[PDB]
């Protein structure tokens, strides 16, 4: 089933964030990265974000598989835990390395105020 062919590419993106949730933060991360990078043809590299993280050596095998199913490079990486289980700041560092200009544009949808982030500098 490796390097096979299949159909099922769909997604959503817009001015309003329909992907707003605690685990699966707004389209700034999952929505934009899975949709915009899906149409990627080496310009940004579907596996470009996943490759940098290097979660697994065999990850690239499945990357080719879901690329036609709405992205596997970034989508599979985010979908590895629950839905995304990541934060905009975490992927922002990776995005900067790759140079994803479009991602930067949509990353502003997350917001810089009232965000679900904690300092985590407390002990008890």
Swiss-Prot record:
Protein name, per record: Interleukin-1 receptor-associated kinase 3
Description of its domains: The nucleotide binding domain binds ATP with low affinity.
Gene it is expressed from: IRAK3
Annotated signal peptide: none
Residue ranges annotated for the Death domain, each copy included: 46-111
Family: Belongs to the protein kinase superfamily. TKL Ser/Thr protein kinase family. Pelle subfamily.
Disease: Asthma-related traits 5: Asthma-related traits include clinical symptoms of asthma, such as coughing, wheezing, dyspnea, bronchial hyperresponsiveness as assessed by methacholine challenge test, serum IgE levels, atopy and atopic dermatitis.
Effect of residue 115 to E: Phosphomimic. Slight decrease in the interaction with PIN1. Weak interaction with PIN1 in absence of IL33-mediated dendritic cell stimulation. Increases resistant to degradation. Localizes to the nucleus in absence of stimulus
Function: Putative inactive protein kinase which regulates signaling downstream of immune receptors including IL1R and Toll-like receptors. Inhibits dissociation of IRAK1 and IRAK4 from the Toll-like receptor signaling complex by either inhibiting the phosphorylation of IRAK1 and IRAK4 or stabilizing the receptor complex. Upon IL33-induced lung inflammation, positively regulates expression of IL6, CSF3, CXCL2 and CCL5 mRNAs in dendritic cells.
Quaternary structure and partners: Monomer. Homodimer; disulfide-linked. May interact with IRAK4 (when phosphorylated). Interacts (when phosphorylated at Ser-115) with PIN1 (via WW domain) in response to IL33-mediated (but not TLR4 ligand LPS) dendritic cell stimulation.
Compartmental location: Cytoplasm; Nucleus
Provenance organism: Homo sapiens (Human)
Variant or mutagenesis effect after changing residue 116 to A: Probable risk factor for ASRT5; abolishes phosphorylation of Ser-115; abolishes interaction with PIN1; no effect on cytoplasmic localization; reduces protein stability
Expression across tissues: Expressed in eosinophils, dendritic cells and/or monocytes (at protein level). Expressed predominantly in peripheral blood lymphocytes.
Site entry (Cis/trans isomerization of proline peptide bond), positions: 115-116
List of residues that carry Phosphoserine: 115
